[model samples]
Target: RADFIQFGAMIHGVGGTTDGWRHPDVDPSASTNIEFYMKKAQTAEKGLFSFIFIADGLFISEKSIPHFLNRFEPITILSALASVTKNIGLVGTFSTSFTEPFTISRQLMSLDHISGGRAGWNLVTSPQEGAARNHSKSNLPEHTERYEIAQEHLDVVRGLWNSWEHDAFIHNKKTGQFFDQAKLHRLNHKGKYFQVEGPLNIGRSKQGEPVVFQAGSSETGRQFAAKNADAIFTHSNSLEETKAFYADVKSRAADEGRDPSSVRIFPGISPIVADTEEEAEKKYREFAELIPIENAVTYLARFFDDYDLSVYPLDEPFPDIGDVGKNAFQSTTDRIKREAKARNLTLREVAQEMAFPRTLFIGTPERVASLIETWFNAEAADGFIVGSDIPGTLDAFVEKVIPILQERGLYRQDYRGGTLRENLGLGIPQ
Candidate 1:
């Protein structure tokens, strides 16, 4: 048997790529099309993927252009997807920054029950300025404060999931005793940001409680995930960085009296795949050509939360670093500086590096598998979250790369029994 590693994708392609939104093969309408996701979910199952995460954000662009959050609500989409796929886990991103713990907990439990226990929650604290505006706040909360709220939110949600003991529901039809009311416990939770009265409406899901996944790389984020998350999604450009991050997160878990091995770290990897190395190179060139220059620049600007890249030459030395604001891309800039200073790469070259996802593992099946093996052996990550390079990109990986790993005994050919949590070797929630 292979070690427990989750192989999944973030479904962002349905929204057009920066400049290549109009690619002939991509369906721009995928954001609104249930059938498209349904197909993708089935495809994920074909690869024995543990889950297919549908990322949700609550904010639209500050410029007022339509975006993913404006398209479809994530839970509704995942609920529909659950009906179509039997084994693959369905995870949705929801925020503690704006939503109440009770509602989020109840909804996730319902989804888990509906899906026969194949459900997961990717917890987040809303990070965008526009998201704050939508939530009726004049400004977004500081990163530290947001994480504080998120930690409390998760504590309450997890408590509610366990309020009712196992076998709490006992029905005696003849006695007209529908349930063991005494077995149910109320979570009288009072926190700085929330007040919740509890005993969640739904019982524990089949998988115990829905698997919790977290993706915050900041100090506060690392602490929160360590205490609560079963899986963590992170981004890194090199194995050393990844190894450091992995060790730090696991150490936090150990400090909290939790099993360090239970927390899986999956780095984001965008692969440019093809039949041959030369073909892969050609594909990468094609993607670069299709990307619009203006879009690439604008996207990077927004990524760093509107920091100006106009101050320096693209091919010259790096600009004097500015405040990266509160966005995740702050680390992206940090990584660029670290790499450039270490290797003497130019600013233009740094931009080129950031052109794709942080981890762009490029090549054919053999090359890709070798890179994956290196990361695995180094303990840099437990697995990877594959992002689409172009339309049908994941399809290419499922076809070519998965079998190679299976043959090498680095990946599974059949799923382990039980819920997503169980398959991942995480014991069912208590």
Candidate 2:
């Protein structure tokens, strides 16, 4: 078992709503300010968090949530964040479907260098079909094909990162020698999806390579992460599901001749904490009441490839959206279908359920901390990606919950290393 658990702060900005943004304590404009991100990054650093994660999307529409409607480009924002914080890792999302491997390699390598090696890339294949239109395509590629492109894209990027050896740059000013020519190499990659020749513009950083983080729940996604990812972000909502996923991914990695422990799994969690359990419940209730049922239906429809459920009677049984979302987020669509069937819920009931899903962890500091410890010890998760959209939520968690974790010896008192890989205890990829 590891000595300390890893934690990543998911900056909400405009991604989702908890109605915590309406709290008197939260700054409404915090999402747009660099200073806001800096403050959060610094707080996470102080609490010994592993990273500050920025989620991104390439397309938006009327059906899009408020946060998705507008937001900064992740890589660019993370680059700016790198300057303000020292130890906590900076991770940004970029989809392989719309980006060139070389460009991504250069940009991330640049961030790694700028941050002195505290950089991570959350690789994703854009799931929304609307994104295809943004990129001048009529529709999204089939699900399996997207993963195929992602696999080859990752290969090219990894190859390019190795173009220059650690000792490639030797500025011998006295001898008038600049660099070691023999140490330089070219990728010269030619794959089905991409073809790029020659060396990358940048050399290796202190971490050797920027850490790779992936989020995918499909079978192909699982296999891809097993073969390549240093860490995986998951959405498992229960201990049973989490354990199953953990075992599956680790076993697959082991089958690929890789150490199972090398891949870290982090499930997303949003905790509404208060000084007392009653107060916490009240806070959650208030937020849940703010979401309109109509909005919830629209939001739920997004997971099903925008299969319009508005036409269905709200009180009627959940209608079958057959073969819908086959090319989008299949796992979520399947989960919803299974859940609706098991409970025999109506369309309105399911919409309400989606709006206010069961809370996995919500209580006083002690209770929240205890639940986290239980999950970590059970090997259900390596840690959690703490999602905070409200202004004071992250600060509250750091101030209230972190002390308990540190006291229990489940978290670090201080950072263990300088680079992201060192702190995460992940091996540097060659």
Candidate 3:
């Protein structure tokens, strides 16, 4: 049996719903407010969450959801949270497609040092076609090609992280030696997509390197993650689906000569908990009502490479946008298509479904806790990433649900270690 479950909070800013900002009590400027993030960080730390996750994308338009239109760059915001909170891990996405390994290595290493080893890098390959335009490219790379670039990109970054050996920095005052010369190495990496001569100027921090996280669900994505990621963020919504994914990824890691246990898999879950089940149901209904159908349509269209769904009749069956999102989020596109086809859903129905996806766990604290434990015990997840667009949802979970889980011995009552890697039980990279 898994003794404990790791929990992460996806800071509610711009990722989930457009109407989140309009919530009666939510701060409209929470997306840009450092104090808001600080409070979230502090609150998550108080609940003993392993990390606070921030997602990123490079481009946006009117068709883009509200969260995409206005948001701080992930790393910049996470760096600020590092200073305000002590224990919670700060993780942010950085795409491998447009950014160089050298700059990313330095930035993450700096954050690791600043946060006393609570930094994480959520590596991604940008999937938006518009994002390519922002980076002087005519179109996004094909799915497999993007993963290929990402694999090499990760290799370069990991090499840069290990450029200096653990004992390289001596700072011997009498000898006037800041670092041992022989202990340093340069990565003369020459790859199809990148050529990085990296001996990243920044030295490794207390935790050696920041933890690496990946969120790819495709075949290439799984293999890449199994070979490299210390953790993976998933969107599996059902028990069977989550279980199969968890087992497959672990098996792949084992085949790669890596300890499967070392690769933590966390599925995202948004729980609406309250003192009573009826209250929770009411809250869910209220949240569902807040989302507009247009917002849902826009959000769903993004999965298909921003194919204009508004151009099609909402009451008509979802048109076959054949191979449209081939260069983008392939897995998501497939999932949506599969669901729409299986259910014979119309465009309007699909839009409503996407706008307010079902909450994974909802009820009183005990019911929510039991559902989490059931999944954890069944080996369906190493943990869950709590995601919400509402302001008070996370706070409610921490204040109401965490205690029940802690009492049941399914979660930590207090943090067990200093660094994020330690808390996550991931070994330091050699």
Candidate 4:
């Protein structure tokens, strides 16, 4: 919003995890329940969220949809959400790995039209070998190779989105002129990773193309985001690191001949808030206590694949599980350790603390507000994509923290426009 900082909330889809779903207040059924998510969405919209991003993944550990994968498809859920809400955007993640550019382009463009320009696409490359196998491949392509394919896939998708010019449609039933041929462009594109014959079937929407968003932050990831992303979702442990990342990505955008500010950098923030500092700290400690060590250990060990951590003491420092290849998230963990010796925590402590990439903005509203202000003042981020340590954490943020931010002139009190891009001051797509 013009008067408010950009605020978006990412619903933690699976609510059954140690750090997430285990919250006593959360509905465990939310993992498979649409009503639960709908309730969350309505609450977020009330809290002034510009958009609610639906996180998605393709295959489970063994080439099947995880039994736990939320059954409600994002588009369908968002469409339902759209019917019930007025201003909030609905961004859904869809993969570039196995889907055809034309199919994805047409689908998202159509969503934008149906939502009346409140749709956004979170582009991603499927990373799991199981995903690849599900798509009939024996193994996933290497990470760098996956990005290469993703780059080409995006180019084709954008071309497909542009296949029909802004004024392509003419629903003249008398003359039967459904479209103006001159407004159409066939994109006969061939690349190392894909072949697409386009002129997508759908017409362009009011936002041009649904706002493009990306989440990867590897070297290739930054380049991809710079070239195409409207919003970037990232995780950072501290302001200094976030500042460097924000600058680096923006500079990359400029280098690519795009408006640097066009790409919004939103680092994730999971707040631990309460009425008082003591209460908030106590709440945080309580949540940490509930973390199932088995789940935490299993999750962390998988980053290095074969590096089994089950053999180590729960309190021991992380052994030199050297060079887990191409871990974008692990880099943040390494930085946290490298930056502080006094705050040195054991592997388990770091595991618990670094469970998610977000810098936990912990404290009472006043203290948390100060930390957020520092992030903005330092150019560490444009705004934050509010992730939750528990269900209703974001609700607390909207009620308790938004007022403080608004009172301080840091957040908006009302809607700026109908479109998500406009609300974020991104300007209409060219």
Candidate 5:
């Protein structure tokens, strides 16, 4: 897996919108469906994927988890996925914003042991404001403080992870010595926001640290991710900008005194692969038409703090929202503004594109493979995290695009080891 690009399936079902569930092929009920997730897990495992990822938040969004849709949290879903699949990593999300450091530390550490060392933490901060109320906060914080809190939250989490030493447990009944006193360290940590009293009861798994992934793109977010994350999960809206973010983060990692290439970049790609380009185009059209222009308009709003895009006439040029949604998805909203300004697209066109943006990654299996290879070679991404609005897209990816990638020596043919660290070629942090 070291020399090859990796793939992860972002499996949240329905995610119905534009309404994406309007597609005849997608099952709207799949969000709460366990068997459906299991199938996705099994399918991705068969494809020799490096891992499977899930987004975590108390609130629901149309993209990852549907609005007003009930969804499983990462630990539960990932553990369920772990039960059915082998050789694939399970990366789960937990926000540093509302959750306690000790709480998430225990859960992720437990997940690592349960999954037999195939676990990762997608560390993130809750960007949507109202989520804070659920956790007893009265107001949402700025990007600056959110990441500041994250910085120390991670410190406590990692410190707690080291509570029990490598050989702490001898489990020798003959000598009545189950643990060595010197091996176990009590981590009495006091930080800017969190104070954790450790010796986490759980010992380290075969892999000492769960792989860390972060998706922050703001200036502060980028440095935090570069200094910390083993991998980065990102969105693939355009190649030119993607290469810039990729280079920016890698340089930050290098500046932080780490190997630039080891900080893997995985963008979320929704590739609609088919036997022919027309067939692929047909599939894109089928999905695109389902989204009414109104749904398309609101879709753009959520990213921008729900700025009322409906105020503008659909035929006019996309108007300036002026960094309104910067607090939400900082980089995402910024791109939406720039793309509208640069291309001179109409409101309707921008809405249609935002709801279901036509992408460079869509085409025939060969074309999709080439696109991915082009991006990988050009350093747009080290790998990709695959998800789809249509149900059959992922299945088609494994059946078609993966083989092309494998044959071309761009992807791995098989598992490297049972542990995610080994498969990802990441060192377990000291």
Candidate 6:
């Protein structure tokens, strides 16, 4: 498996587009449907995907997408899949800003144990300003400070994960002895944001603990991810941007005195696949038209910390809002502003792209497969996260694109190991 690219599938409700649920193939109720999740998980496993990811948010409003309005709680859904999936990794997104360290540590490890070490938790400093209200905070910290507090939060949780050593528990019947007392250690973590004293009740699972995943793209975000996580989850707009990001994160990991290869970088993307070129274009249009410019404009406001984009006329040039929402999603708001100015696009034009990315991966199976390799071979990405939505995109990729990768010696014929860590070719942490 030398120099092969890795891929994962994100199994979620209606998908990124606000209107995706209205597609005939997607169930409007898919967000809460157990059967839909099972099918998506099984499909990813069938294609030999390394993992299936679940994204989360703490709160939503009337403008929020259908998926955001009602969805399965991360731990419960993953626990359900633990019984249903035999090999594929289950990763859930949990926000450090809104939750307690001890609780997050216990839940992730619990999933790791239940899945026989096929669990991963993608840590985030939750993005939405509205999310703060749900967690009893009047406001969210500025972007840099959020990551500042997150560093300590991650430290406490990781300490709790190591509460018991690998050989801590050894069941005894004849000898009448249980766990070794000396093998258990207290976390005793006290920090600027959190104070937790402990030994967690459970020991490590077969893979020691759940693999760590982190998502953020700003300067501070990059450093936190490189120094702490086993893998990094990110977004990509172009090969140059992605390759630049890939090298920066990997280089930072090495600077922090860790193996660069241990810090895998995965960019989340949505690809539309079909049997014919024209058919693919038609499919893209189907969902593209479903988005109301009204809904698209509303969605853009959240990234700028709820600045009302609606106040600007639809056909006018994209507004020049100075450093607004820099505290919300710093990198993304920057990208939107930068691109709008460069392209001389109107407000409506940018809003439409927000409805669904003018996806670079929409085409026939061969074309989709080819684009993936182009990005991989150039080291733009270590792996790609395929979004589950847009009608038949998931099934088509598994049935069509995966076979092409298999034929090219770029993918697995069967799973290489039982644990998610082994399958992803990452080392277990002590």
Distance (Å) between predicted and true CA of 23, model 3? 2.3
Lowest-lDDT window of 10 residues in candidate 6? Answer: 321-330
Pairs in steric clash, model 2 = 14-67
Model 3 per-residue lDDT tens digits across residues 1-430: 6558999998856446666566676777777777887887888898999999998889899977677778889888988898888788899999998888888988999999898999999999756878999998898898888888888888898899999998999999999999999999999999898898878888787788999999878888898899989999897678999999999999999999998999999999988888898988777766666778787877787777546778899899987774643645678777888888998888877777777765769888888888998999999999999975665778898998899888888888799787999889887866
Can you tell me which runs of candidate 6 are displaced by over 4 Å? 293-354
lDDT of 2 by residue, 1-430 (tens): 5557889998767438644456555566666767777788888888899999998888887877666766778888898888888888989898889889999999999999999999899999756888899887899889989999999998898899999998888999999778899999988888898999969999999899899999878898899999989999998578899989988999999999998888999999888778988888777666665667778888777776556788889998998774653655777778888998998988887777688775767889999899999989988899889987645667778999999999998988889888999998887766
lDDT of 1 by residue, 223-282 (tens): 889998999999857889999999999999999999898998889888877788787876
Candidate lDDT scores, in order, read 0.78, 0.84, 0.85, 0.76, 0.84, 0.86
In model 5, which regions exceed 4 Å deviation? 60-68, 293-351
lDDT of 5 by residue, 1-430 (tens): 2368888888877863537876777777787789889998899998988899987567545554352367777799998888889889999888888878889899998989988999999998755786877778897788788888998999888888899887889999999999999998888987788888787888898889688999988888889999999999877878988899999999999999999977999988888888888988888877777768887777666776546777889899988775553464678777888998999988887777777777677888999999899888889898899986577888999999999999998887889888888888787765
Residue 276 accuracy (lDDT) in model 1:
88
Q: Taking the tens digit of each residue's C-alpha lDDT, what string does model 4 give over 39-113?
A: 778888887888988877666543332324545677777777777777888998888888888888888888888
Tens digit of lDDT per residue, candidate 6, span 191-238? 889999999988898898888899878888889899999989888788
Model 1 vs. true fold: TM = 0.85
Error of 6 at 412 (Å): 1.1
| Model 3, runs deviating above 4 Å | 292-354
Candidate No. with top lDDT: 6
Where model 2 places Cα greater than 4 Å from the true spot, the runs are 18-28, 293-354
Model 4 has a clash total of: 3
- For candidate 3, what is the lDDT? 0.85
The collision pairs in model 4 are: 4-411, 4-412, 15-21
